[PDB]
Structures are given as structure tokens and as C-alpha cells.
Amino acid sequence: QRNEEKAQREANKKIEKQLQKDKQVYRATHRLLLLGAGESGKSTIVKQGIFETKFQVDKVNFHMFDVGGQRDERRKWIQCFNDVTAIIFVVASSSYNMVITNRLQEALNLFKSIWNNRWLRTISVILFLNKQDLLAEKVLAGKIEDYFPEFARYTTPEDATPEPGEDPRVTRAKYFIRDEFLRISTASGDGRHYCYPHFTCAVDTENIRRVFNDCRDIIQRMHLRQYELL
Amino acid sequence: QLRQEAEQLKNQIRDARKACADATLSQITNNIDPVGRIQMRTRRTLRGHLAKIYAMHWGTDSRLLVSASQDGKLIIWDSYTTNKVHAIPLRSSWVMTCAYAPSGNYVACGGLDNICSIYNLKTVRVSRELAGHTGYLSCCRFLDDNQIVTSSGDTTCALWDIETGQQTTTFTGHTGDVMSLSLAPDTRLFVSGACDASAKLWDVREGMCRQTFTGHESDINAICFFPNGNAFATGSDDATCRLFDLRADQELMTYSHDNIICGITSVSFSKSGRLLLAGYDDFNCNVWDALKADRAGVLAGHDNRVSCLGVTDDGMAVATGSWDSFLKIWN
Amino acid sequence: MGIVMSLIVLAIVFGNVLVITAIAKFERLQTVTNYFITSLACADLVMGLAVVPFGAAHILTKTWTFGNFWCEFWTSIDVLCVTASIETLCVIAVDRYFAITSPFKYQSLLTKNKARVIILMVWIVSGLTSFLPIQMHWYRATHQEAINCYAEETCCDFFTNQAYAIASSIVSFYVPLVIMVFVYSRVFQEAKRQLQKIDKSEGRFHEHKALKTLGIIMGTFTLCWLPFFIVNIVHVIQDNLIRKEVYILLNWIGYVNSGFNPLIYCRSPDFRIAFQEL
Amino acid sequence: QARKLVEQLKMEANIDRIKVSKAAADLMAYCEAHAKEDPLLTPVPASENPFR
Numbered sequence A: 001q002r003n004e005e006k007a008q009r010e011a012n013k014k015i016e017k018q019l020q021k022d023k024q025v026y027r028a029t030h031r032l033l034l035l036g037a038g039e040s041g042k043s044t045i046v047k048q049g050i051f052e053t054k055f056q057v058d059k060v061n062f063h064m065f066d067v068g069g070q071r072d073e074r075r076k077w078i079q080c081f082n083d084v085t086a087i088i089f090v091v092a093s094s095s096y097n098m099v100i101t102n103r104l105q106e107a108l109n110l111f112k113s114i115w116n117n118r119w120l121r122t123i124s125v126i127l128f129l130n131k132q133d134l135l136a137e138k139v140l141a142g143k144i145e146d147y148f149p150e151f152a153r154y155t156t157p158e159d160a161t162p163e164p165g166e167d168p169r170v171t172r173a174k175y176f177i178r179d180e181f182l183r184i185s186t187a188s189g190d191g192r193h194y195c196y197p198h199f200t201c202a203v204d205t206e207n208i209r210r211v212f213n214d215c216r217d218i219i220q221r222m223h224l225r226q227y228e229l230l
Numbered sequence B: 001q002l003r004q005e006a007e008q009l010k011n012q013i014r015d016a017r018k019a020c021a022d023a024t025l026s027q028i029t030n031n032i033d034p035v036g037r038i039q040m041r042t043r044r045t046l047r048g049h050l051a052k053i054y055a056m057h058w059g060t061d062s063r064l065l066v067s068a069s070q071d072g073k074l075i076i077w078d079s080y081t082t083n084k085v086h087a088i089p090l091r092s093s094w095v096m097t098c099a100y101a102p103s104g105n106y107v108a109c110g111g112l113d114n115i116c117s118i119y120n121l122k123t124v125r126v127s128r129e130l131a132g133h134t135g136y137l138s139c140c141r142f143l144d145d146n147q148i149v150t151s152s153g154d155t156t157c158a159l160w161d162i163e164t165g166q167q168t169t170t171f172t173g174h175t176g177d178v179m180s181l182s183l184a185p186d187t188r189l190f191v192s193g194a195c196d197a198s199a200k201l202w203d204v205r206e207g208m209c210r211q212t213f214t215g216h217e218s219d220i221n222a223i224c225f226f227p228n229g230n231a232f233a234t235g236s237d238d239a240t241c242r243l244f245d246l247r248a249d250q251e252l253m254t255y256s257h258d259n260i261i262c263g264i265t266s267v268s269f270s271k272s273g274r275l276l277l278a279g280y281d282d283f284n285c286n287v288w289d290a291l292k293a294d295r296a297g298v299l300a301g302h303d304n305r306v307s308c309l310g311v312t313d314d315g316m317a318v319a320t321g322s323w324d325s326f327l328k329i330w331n
Numbered sequence C: 001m002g003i004v005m006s007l008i009v010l011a012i013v014f015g016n017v018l019v020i021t022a023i024a025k026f027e028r029l030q031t032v033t034n035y036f037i038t039s040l041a042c043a044d045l046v047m048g049l050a051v052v053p054f055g056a057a058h059i060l061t062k063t064w065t066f067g068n069f070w071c072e073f074w075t076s077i078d079v080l081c082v083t084a085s086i087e088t089l090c091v092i093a094v095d096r097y098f099a100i101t102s103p104f105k106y107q108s109l110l111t112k113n114k115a116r117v118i119i120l121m122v123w124i125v126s127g128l129t130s131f132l133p134i135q136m137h138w139y140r141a142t143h144q145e146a147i148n149c150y151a152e153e154t155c156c157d158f159f160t161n162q163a164y165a166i167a168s169s170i171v172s173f174y175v176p177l178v179i180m181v182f183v184y185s186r187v188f189q190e191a192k193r194q195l196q197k198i199d200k201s202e203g204r205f206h207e208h209k210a211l212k213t214l215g216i217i218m219g220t221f222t223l224c225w226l227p228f229f230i231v232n233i234v235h236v237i238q239d240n241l242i243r244k245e246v247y248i249l250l251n252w253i254g255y256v257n258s259g260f261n262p263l264i265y266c267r268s269p270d271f272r273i274a275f276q277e278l
Numbered sequence D: 001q002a003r004k005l006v007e008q009l010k011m012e013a014n015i016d017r018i019k020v021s022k023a024a025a026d027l028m029a030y031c032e033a034h035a036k037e038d039p040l041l042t043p044v045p046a047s048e049n050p051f052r
Ligand SMILES: Nc1nc2c(ncn2[C@@H]2O[C@H](COP(=O)(O)OP(=O)(O)OP(=O)(O)O)[C@@H](O)[C@H]2O)c(=O)[nH]1
Pocket: A036, A037, A038, A039, A040, A041, A042, A043, A044, A045, A130, A131, A132, A133, A134, A200, A201, A202, A203
């Protein structure tokens, strides 16, 4: 009777001591969700059931999640990832002609569905526009207008950043493709979350510094908005 | 050809059960005196989880219960003295369900890894891992000490043999993801609610569907039998709860209000079946009168949405969990 | 003057009690940042409860009747409450600085035990500069008028030396002022940099807020506490230039600042819904 | 799966079902009989309440 209560309290204190240790690790780790649209090269990005990976840069722990065990058009499980730091979206920008409703429009529809979600209403998205080299190759080779009629009246932005030795056609193509996502991102945003688009290729090696900087910007903007300074 | 006969068969079923509706449930129960106002107050508050809570299950002794959370823990509480008994760390941090054995010697778990894990409490280490589902697990209940039934997101349910780790039988027939299940008091039949706005009645011994109920219009999130065993209640994300009768093969009453527009996460009955407790996405729970479809009480002491709910076997307390990493006991 | 003085007391007490009871009653406001706000609210509540009514009675009756010991006790409580309230704003500014400038290490840097230690240290330093140098008679002036004031039983006025009037003023005001200025300049710089970064990326598809917020925060505090801490040094450096009425008026203007902190640091939507629930 | 769907409908449609009045009466009788031992309906005294 009297000894039973003492034994119960001894085990509870030991358990609570360990729970304090695990709280430090949980609060210092950043969770990321990786998404893709079919054949998009997202496996190459992570190369260099559910699958989890661990990596660390500048003594900061990141932990990425890739879902491949569930394949459906209704993502009922997506409400679990409402506390992640950011979402990584990988799309192949060079698949406008491929129909196997072409792939680019389906990716745009998926992005629109994800952005306007009741649970993911405060989560930012890091956008990777993969496969740039072969996109430029097929653009140089002898038409986006045959699939995207709005391209017939597009002009390259004045405040653009063309790469060195770049034909002004491929730059217009990339900026058109990026603005397609950017207009959806800015159409229904109230400052609670933003989008960070990047142009990516296979030979890129600085894809982790980009994620680090984008997460830093996300957290800093969150704090600035919280303290009524933004 | 084949599709033509399907429409004819579905037509007579509607006509067969249309002639059986002699009167409504509410018409019979107009003379019953109302239950009146019901007020409940929080007795205990359990703290220690680092993240939101998705699952909860009471014990057969009505003293201990288990809970699951996204941080990767499986904590067993002591509701009387508020003392943690066990803390099982999980290999996978994504957990969607948990169960407590009737004997009290084992606890099950599962989630986004498509695996069900059984733990040994009286030895704590993993005792068995069940594999074969191609979708995320949604629920699991213990039939006995050696067999267990599970539902997953691949539109199928299975009955497992824990000793050998092999599926004894598989239940097919749904089109969308299966979200919940519940066992009968005699452990011979069970019901399942899926995302195609339908509920089915299965036979554990035989392995084939008996009846189908399609009164809803949205994803069904929860399901629970009447204590008698001849009726059950469902809850969808269109702010409606419905009562279905097995022997009448049709629904009897609906529970809805014009001031409620959120979804429903969980449902449960009381000891006598007079009350129906349902959790909502609007941060609080509601208490209904089963035979009248009118509200009788509100439990509004949670900061974020309620995800789970349960009632003790003796019917002495009600436990609710939410996404603010808190558990509360209402008496 | 009685009506205005009574209204000021009610405003200070009513606002501070509401903030304290809101944090304790609700479990969603238990935050490391809110502990500093709780300490500040307690400081201003004690100020409004103790210092102001007795000063008002002394001004209205033109005499002191409680004795030669309660006068010193009242002066000590005055200095203790004034010093501890200003030093908490510095802690809040440093907290925001660490939150914004170093976002990855903010969780590791600040812990509840660390917050408690910081609060206790602030209160100890505040109490070590008010009760100790006053109850030990280390601040007393030496001129004849001060001697007569100390000897008199019904007279309770403030006379101090050069050393105390310099050290107490410096500790209470001058270091926190420069620390807050340095913190908030960098906070504004970071906010402006992020605002400029947002426009290049998606500017064609669409710093007043930060300027207004920082202006309010710094302006209310400076305009409330600067003239008094200037005349405190000036009236000791040079004699017969500030009348006692100016000193009392500026001190009371400084006292008024205790009633504005709930309006500034408790405008969050969570605080608004907490007040609505109560 | 065209043939399987029709076969299930035929098996399910050939069942004997009772009228709604009998089921409602049975539910009402069960509730009325077992409502005595329902601690949630009528609060129990604090002497016999383990949670208070
Ligand atoms: N030229 C070029 N080829 C690429 C690039 N990324 C992927 N590929 C090719 O596409 C193939 C697919 O690569 P994976 O890493 O498996 O990507 P994935 O299979 O499409 O990823 P998922 O379909 O989402 O599973 C690879 O074998 C590469 O040869 C790229 O950036 N540039």
C-alpha cells in the first residue's frame, strides 16, 4: 500500500528525466518533406514504406522525408506534415511536349492543389526546376507555343539574370516556366508563406547550401512577422 | 450487358427497404422525456507528449490507457494517480493508430511505414512485425491474444496470425482508403468506414461482406457499434452523424446542426447507449441524445482540434486527446 | 488634482492585474518571452500599488505623518521599483535581437532555467542599488538644509550627493538606453534587408510597419524617462537652477509610463482573445 | 470485375429484413432497461467516484 505508491513515483521520475533529454534533440532538428511529379529526377537530388535521410551543415541537423509507399491522387495523409519547416518540390521543366494532358500542366495543377490547402496554410515551398541542360538543348533544336499559347506574347523580364554565353531564347523559356508557378504562388498569398524557385541541373553540387539559406530565410521571416516588424 | 443488370439489382434494394419504413425513430420517441442538460468537468490532465496526439485506447481494467504521438513515443498512463508507467520509443516517427490487448500483455502500433508492430509489456521490446499491406495503416484491434485485424490505405483489410505473421484472410470490396473499423461485442463481425462514403459489414469467420450502407456523402472518419450490437454510428467531414440499423438495413436518424460546418474526427457511445459523444474540428466535443437528435452538453477545454475519444468499459470517465499534446479525463 | 491622481492609480492597477491573471490562467501563454512580461507587470503593479498613493497623499496634505522610518522605506521602494522596471525592457530587446538575428541557435540559447536566472539576477541588482545605499545612509546630503530635513519628523524630502545621483542614474537609465538603441538598429536593418530581398523575386506580381513599431516602442520610453534623468544630474552638478516643482513634475511624468506597458507589449491576438474570454 | 459486382449484389439483396418500428422499439427498450447503471447520465456521489 504505502510502498506501492513510492515505487510508482520512482519510475515516473526516471521516465521524466529521459523525456527532458529527448526534448532538446526534438526542438533542434528541422523536418523537411520531399515531393515530386513522376519521373522528375528527385532521386538524383537526394543521391547527391517511407524513406528518411539525415544530413548536417554548419552544425545544424536536417531530416528529410520522402514518401514512395503510397501512390494515389488523393493525398489523405498530407495533413500529418503541417509542422514541417519547408516542402521541397521537384519538377522537370523540360517535359512540356511530353504527354505521358502534358506533364508540366499536371505538375502545375498539383502545385496549385498543394498551395491552397487548409492544413498547409503556413508552410513555405522550395521549388527546384530540374533538367535545364536538355531543356536548353531541345529549345535550341527546331515549340512551346504549340502547347502553351500564352507564350506567343511573352517578353523576357528586364530585371533578369541571364547566364554567361546564353542564347536569349532559352532564358525566355526558363523565365516563362518559372513565372507560371510564381503567379499561382502570389495569387493567393497573404504573407504567411512564400516560394523559393531555383534552376537545377544534374551536375549541380550546391543544392544543400540553397536549402540551408532558404530555411534560414523562412525562420527569420516567420520571427519578423510574429514581432509585427513585417 | 453486365452493367445493365447492376442497375436493376440496385433498384429493387431501394424498393425493398422503402416498404419496410413503417415509421421513423423520432416518431416513436416523441413521448420520451428529455434527458436534460448534462455538465461535465475535467478531472485529470496528462502531460508529457512532445507533439500532437493521433491515437488513444482504454484498458479493459478501466485504469490504464495508451496514447501515441508524432514525436515517436508510446506512453502508458495511470489515470488514477497520474503516473507514467512505460515509454516505448518507436523506430518510425509517423504513427496513426494504437491498440491495447484485452489481456493487457501486448500493445500494437502502426502508421506510414505500412508495418504493424506488437510489443511485449510483461517480459519491453518488439515481439512481431506484420508486413504485407501496400498502404498506410489506419486502425487495428485485438480479436484475441494471437490474432488481430487491421485496416490500411490500400482499400483492403486483413486478419493476421501473430504466431506465424501471415495473413489468414483478406477483405476486399472498398474503392477508397479505409479510415476506421470497430469490432462487435461477441468478436464475430465488424464494420469499416472508407473514403467512398460507404460502410460495410464483414464476417470474420467466413470472410465475405454481408451488407452495405451508403447514407453519407463524404469521407467517413469514425465508426462505433451500439452497445447492444444491432446498430452503429458513423461520422464524416460534412458535420453529420448517422445511425444505421443492421436488421432494418437502413439508417434511422441523423445528427446535424446549422451552426456546425467543420469535420468530425471521432465518435463513441455511452454505457447504456443513450448518449453519443463526437469530436469535432472546431476545437471541442459535443454530446447528443441518441433517441432524440438534440444536443445536451459541450466539452470545450482543448486548444486545438480533438483527434481521439474513448469511454471506459464500466462507463465512469471519458478521455479525449487533441493536437496540443494533452490528454484530459472528463467525468 | 485629487481626481486625476485617483484615476492614474486605477489605470495602473487595473491593467497590470489583467495581464498577470491572463498568463497564469491560460496554458497557451506559458512562454519564455512571457516571463519577462510577467516580471515587468509585477514591477509596475507594485509601483502603482505602493509608490503612487503615498506620494499623492504627501503632495495633497503638504506634510508627512508616517514618521522618519517609513519615509526612507518609501524612498527605497521607489528606487527599487523604478530601477527594476526599466531593466526588463533591455532583457526583452535582447531576447528579440537573439530571436531574429540568430534563428537557428535561439532555442538552445534561451531556456526556462536561464530565464529564471536572468530575472533573479535583474531583481537582485535592482535591490542592491536601492535598499543598501539608502538604509545605510550612504546617500545623504551634507548641507544644512538637508540636515534640517533629516532631523525634522514631519518633513520627508529627497536630498542626495554627487556620487549617488551619478551612479544610480547611470545604472537605472544610461546603459539600458544604449543597449536598446544598438539592438533595435540592427533589428531594423535585418527587417529592411528581408523586405528588400522579397521585392526582387516577386515584386512585379503585387518599411512602414517596422518603422512605426520601433518608433512607438522607443519614443514612449524615451519621452517618458529622459527629462527626469537629465535634470537628476543637472540639479546636482549646478545648484539653484531647478525648482523642486519641476523635479516632482518630471518624476510623475516618468511614473505615468507604468500604465502604458500593457498597451505596448500585450497587443498580440492571443492576448486579445484571452482578454475577451475573461 | 464486372461479373463480381453483380454477383455480390444478388447475394446481398436476398436477405430478410424487419420493419423499422420493431428495431426502434428494441433500441428504446434496451436503453430504458439499462439506463439505471449509467454513471454519465446521473452523477455518482463523490464517495464512490474514483476520479474525484
Ligand atoms: N540530363 C539530365 N538527366 C537527368 C537529370 N536528372 C535525372 N536525369 C535522368 O533521369 C533518370 C531518372 O533519375 P532518378 O534519380 O532515378 O529520378 P526519377 O526516377 O525520375 O525520380 P522518381 O520518378 O520521382 O522516382 C536518371 O537515370 C538520369 O539519367 C538531369 O538533371 N539532367
